[PDB]
Amino acid sequence: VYKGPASIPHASAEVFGAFFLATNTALLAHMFPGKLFGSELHVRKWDPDYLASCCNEQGMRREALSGKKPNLWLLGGGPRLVNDSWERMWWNNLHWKRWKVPRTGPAFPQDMYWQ
Amino acid sequence: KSFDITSMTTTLPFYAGWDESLKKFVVTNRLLSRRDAGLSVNNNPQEINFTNPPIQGLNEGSFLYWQTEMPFNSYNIDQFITTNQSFYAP
Amino acid sequence: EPIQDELLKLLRGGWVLLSNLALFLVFSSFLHRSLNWFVQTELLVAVGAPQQAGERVVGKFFEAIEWVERNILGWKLPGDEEAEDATSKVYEVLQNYTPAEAAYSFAQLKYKDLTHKERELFHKAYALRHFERRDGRPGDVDAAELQAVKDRLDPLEADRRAYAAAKAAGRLDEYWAAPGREATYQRIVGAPRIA
Amino acid sequence: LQHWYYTPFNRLLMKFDVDAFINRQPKSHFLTKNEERALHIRRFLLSE
């Protein structure tokens, strides 16, 4: 009947029950797209590349209408000042762009197969 | 009837930028020539020629590093393995 | 209840969780790394030589002792000269043990017009560099004679680069007043240059 | 056992899911065996 000193925090059983049911339901919702009352479960609203391309579009359009030469802002970072390779000079933006397909996801199969 | 069965189209993607002769913000499909893309950059009026992005030669250490990544290999290194040399001169 | 107290209590909880998880991962990494040594010691026991495994364990202790003697104190520990000569680096093997015929420069295969001097210049620039040769100092290749050889082969690309340089500056009629440019315009395009 | 693995009582849930899935396509996309043979024949005669 003795639980503990009550100065050490106790997590309730409802926290584990919610955790257990939520993990199982998340797995089931990922396996069956189209059956969540006709819908599916996404993990984001907008692609970061899509948002950055829209913001660059509006930024260079506003720069051009103000009478200046427009600038493109690069995800990851700008160039390094080196002289040995093109890939070392532009490494940060190249590193952002090389990660495109796993950033988009998902890492699980997109369609259901019955074994 | 025409000589061509299918139409030949330019198949280049588009991008936006500054024109410097029209002095205008422009959508275009004019990309830099493949005869000098990757060899040089111009981030100032002065020009940087890069020192090692295309490999222009090969020894045994760098061949061992890039053995499965090259599009070709020559007889000059493959003389010294007898099965490879038999593939070159059967 | 204040924001500062909540942020500090969150920071302390995150720090203690991350530090204990890192300690568990470091122990698990050691347990993954060292498995082959324990397996070989156990196999040495199980083959029928129980006394030789204790030699392996005390040899690990004596190796730690030898490391402490060699690195901190700096003593000689004789026999180290025979151990130092057993191994070598890649560039030292290139300097000392490889023939010159096992290296090429992509341009001795591309251009048949090359002489022996341009061939060895390309060899020293691109095949075996100054750190891969015995009597090699930096700055062996001139890079101005190399540019002259690279302009002798394929001269029209050099002419194109000279045009682009003259157009970037204001020396365009100084480009056209060179002694061969109007003649090569006449040769390539069958009409004289009107402009 | 390979024949028993594909008996209908063992595949029943699969038969539900595919029946949902294939019914998301337009009805005119379903073809008879004679129709798909005829379309294959027309494809190579059009190449000739």
Add this chain to the structure above:
Amino acid sequence: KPLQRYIPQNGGFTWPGDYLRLEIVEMPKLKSINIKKTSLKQKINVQPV
């Protein structure tokens, strides 16, 4: 055998255009003077060039 794939790779411990040239190779180093010879710990198994 599983056959090997000929895809160019990226990354590494070096910037591109270079290889690992302090990597250790089991291959001996001969001094210029030998006297009271014994043996070599690491031998030269393929002696002719």
Add this chain to the structure above:
Amino acid sequence: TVAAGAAIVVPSGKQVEAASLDIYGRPPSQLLPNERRAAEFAAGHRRWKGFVDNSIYSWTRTLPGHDNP
């Protein structure tokens, strides 16, 4: 340890000019950023080797030659 090591390692301006002028042909503040760090590292490594040679290795070499295996 970090500050105590950094007292040994971190060089002054004269070492950086000294390490630049022999490795490279040029005086400092005329270099690329990546080739300044090479001169700084060479100066710090020289300081480390000099400290180890004159302050740790001057009195630990009394030759107690034993303890082989």
Add this chain to the structure above:
Amino acid sequence: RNEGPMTWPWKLMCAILYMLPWVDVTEKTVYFVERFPAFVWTEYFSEPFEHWYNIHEYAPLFIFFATYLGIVRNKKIPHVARYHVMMGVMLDIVAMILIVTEENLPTGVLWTPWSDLFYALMFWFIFLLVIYCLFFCFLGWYCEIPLISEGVYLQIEQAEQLGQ
């Protein structure tokens, strides 16, 4: 009765004793990782733990007897560390119950994909319990599992007077 908090060496020992049920269910990992490749690292993490828990046939019974007779009943050890040790023992018993269940399946069910679903659910349930308890062990807190933790509290307060 020690009412102090956990410190780091008790946390490390409890993490290893929590690795024991993962070792007892790690055969069935392939039936879950095939569907969800992001957890593929769980195929390879427990390999030296599998080696060291099987050095002798009598090793885990020795571990259970040693922990129960030397940690749980010893009142000088803080109560939350004994709680986590008994939680590891209970999770091990739950995994052994699942193993007993899978060895008595009928032969008709065993030759269907229902056995594959059963294997994946075995691994996933034990993995979820282990990850939850390890999180609250690294924090240093009590975590209450339904239908399990009350028996843990009763067993601690029973093992304590297991002397008079």
Add this chain to the structure above:
Amino acid sequence: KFMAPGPLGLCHAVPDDPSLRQEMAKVAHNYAAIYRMYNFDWDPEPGTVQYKIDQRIRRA
């Protein structure tokens, strides 16, 4: 947005450069040549190529 291949591209304005419209006409011609190899008429009109092909199939 005129470059979009779906219904959103049809409701947007093509610029008035003549060479660009020449290029778009050529691309559409190649796409129609790809389309005709996979999609066929149920009841082809007499005087067309598919009618001739179907007459030969029935004769065979």
Add this chain to the structure above:
Amino acid sequence: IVLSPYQYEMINYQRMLMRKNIWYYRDRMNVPRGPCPLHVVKEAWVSGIVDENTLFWGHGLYDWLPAKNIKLLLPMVRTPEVRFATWIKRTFSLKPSLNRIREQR
């Protein structure tokens, strides 16, 4: 339509082969457009950027084909939410804009 068990197993096998596909399409300038997992294809379909006549490529094909002629692509795309949102976008956004751009020019 009454499907045979042979057809059921063939559909299941094709679904197994196509689970991990990344798609690409061409625009009106014959330029290939970005990496398209299935949810990106659904977003492009709902927005009206692509339709059933757009040229696509994925694994299993040698060349670019219209989407209706690629097997099982349209059943993968046409979720009930996708069909409802495509109808909403076609009826109340694109057709009034098409009539407006026909009258204005």
Add this chain to the structure above:
Amino acid sequence: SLVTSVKDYVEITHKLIEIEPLKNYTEFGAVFTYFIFSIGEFFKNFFSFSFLNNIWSIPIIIPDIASAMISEVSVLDGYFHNAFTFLETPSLVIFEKFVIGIINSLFLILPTSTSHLITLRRFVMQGLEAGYMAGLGTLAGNFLWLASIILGWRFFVIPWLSLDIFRYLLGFVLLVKYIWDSSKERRMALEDLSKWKIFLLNFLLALTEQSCIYPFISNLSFGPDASILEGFPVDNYPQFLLIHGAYLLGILFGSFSLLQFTCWFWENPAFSIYLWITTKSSLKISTSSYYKILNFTFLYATMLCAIASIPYYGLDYTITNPIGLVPQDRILNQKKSQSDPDKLITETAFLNLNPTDKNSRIRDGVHARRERWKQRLIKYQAFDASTYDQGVYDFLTIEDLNYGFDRFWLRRKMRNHQ
């Protein structure tokens, strides 16, 4: 990053061959010297603002025809060539953009995401003012993010989007702290600091990436666009400013009107449905156990919103990408000491494994697990768990690894009696 610092160190040691050669790469004095120098410069740059003085932007200059791809330029029957070049170019349009902003703001506030669930929980379990501040938090955060995208403020948007894993961790920390607070069912009245807490929570959740339930309906927009974040064609600078300002004001007006309608609904119509459930329904439930299961349902839904992205990404993208690696990096396959074919880095040796790779558990002397599903393929890692377009098949076919009775029959030693 860490990998870039390692590359710079290796470049330095390769440079030092011609002056003072090292014994090896991991010599202790050189490694210690470089570690002190690099951590000193890291702290010097961290006391500075490295996101403030660095270069993030470049100008784009179009090559003229002489410098372009010359072999792609063709002349079509004279007078035409295929090197294309085109420019991007009353008060009714201002009112039109205002109305489109109001309709798109109606599209914004559909209850499909994580923040709407928190707002609904504050409306039910707590009072009207708690739900009002939560809704105001989502409104303010959404407006700031949307206005930053529309007006083109890249100095905020692109550096913030570059820190992706930090954004994911911030969302996790906020949701876990909220779940722990909500599981304790604490109940004061309402104070100003506690009013600002819930506003700050929903405001900060608007800046992260959160889960959705009806994403194709929720991303619909009125007009020819894929979203509500795309600009409009304009002819000069004041037309740009007025058109986009009118669209932003329409978004703001519609959002505030919907917030007022939500408050009005939650004052008086809610009690009619509440008494219809609690007195007119034939079901027999107390008023102190209905709230218990309501609290549990809210906890379960927000825990699902916190968990759902964990199977979505692999550990390569979440772990090795912030270290500084690229996909299929060369150091994940680098072996140590030529004659030894084992990987140098055992901490990432699980990444990118083929089914024909050998399994290390079959080494002699190892008392590993029993793996009866692999007993007829014991030398290999005989399963396929591959990702996006990286599948490789060599004498273990796709059908044997993951199809049907071939896969089922290869694993038959799992189902022997023993």
Add this chain to the structure above:
Amino acid sequence: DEFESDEDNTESEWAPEYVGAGLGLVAEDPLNPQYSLRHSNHPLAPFPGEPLKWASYVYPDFTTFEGLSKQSIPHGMGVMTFGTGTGAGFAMSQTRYGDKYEGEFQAGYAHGLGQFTSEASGEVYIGEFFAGQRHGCGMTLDMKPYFYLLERGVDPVEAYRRTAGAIMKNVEVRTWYRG
């Protein structure tokens, strides 16, 4: 014993068929000639295990390949641009930096129909290739005056008007045996 008391000889072990371009075969099924390719490594052979993949490769010499691939080898259709080295079975003296081959690829070789283009010399070849080596009927053009005049800042319509007649008069149509 079927498994241990029998071994295959080196001259009698099964190998995939060589079919070349795949034309002129006897069809087991007259309506489907592709079914006769099933025992070979032809790019249109039905069901070759792993799928054909879209490959984009940059090599260390900056040769690039783009197109279809089989087990990472260029073996269907695509475009190869040449860096400092060589590729597609071409000899080392044939290519320069920035040259291009477009067309059919089998087993890493240029094989079938295609086009070779060089910006540096102006040579264009359209026609047949066998194992990377210019075999069969072909057409050769010299586009050097047009390229030369484009590099010196002449707009393309004026350049074509200056050079088109001399380019058209020098077209060569020939048969090639092996290069």
